[PDB]
Amino acid sequence: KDEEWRRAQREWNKVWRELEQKVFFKSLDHLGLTFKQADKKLLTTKQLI
DNA sequence: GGCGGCCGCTCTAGAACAGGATGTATATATCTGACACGTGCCTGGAGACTAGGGAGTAATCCCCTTGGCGGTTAAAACGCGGGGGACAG
Structure with a gap:
């Protein structure tokens, strides 16, 4: 059992x-x-405004 | 002395139980008629061989579905009113 488990x-x-x-x-x-989604979400015009 | 309340008595009826009835469940007796075993073939599959052709695999490619974002307004969901229908009778 040990050998097969090994x-x-x-x-x-x-x-x-x-x-x-x-x-x-x-x-x-x-x-x-x-x-990849947060950068698109937060690097927008209204978020920076 | 009259009348409401209470308990006992008899009437009535629901229901559990036992007996009769008739169409099936079985215990043989015997028929019987296909069932499977044996035989004799014999006709289609198998060993062997030849040849070739369609897919397995490898490569490419471009393409198409999945993930992933929001906007928005149509719609699911919640709740209130109520109203007509499923169902018990």
């Missing part, structure tokens, strides 16, 4: 890491995730 963890490890490589940095971005 190799199960081993081949799950690669997909786990490749998913976390693109997930973690985007997760750390909080304001920048909504920046």
Whole structure:
């Protein structure tokens, strides 16, 4: 059971890491995730007025 | 002495229960008639082979649906009045 759980963890490890490589940095971005819409919303004429 | 109130008595009726009735549930007896087993083929699938052609895969590309924004006014939702219909009878 230990050996099979170990190799199960081993081949799950690669997909786990490749998913976390693109997930973690985007997760750390909080304001920048909504920046693509907030910049369009707030850099307008009436907002600056 | 008269009358309202209370309790007992008999009348009546709803309902649970038992018995009769008639059309089906079964216990054999026996028929019987297709069921499946055996046989004899024999005719269509399978091994093997030849050839070729349509899709799997790779690449591209441009295109089209998803996410994502607001504006706005049409509309969903809430609530009040009420009114005509579903349903019990």
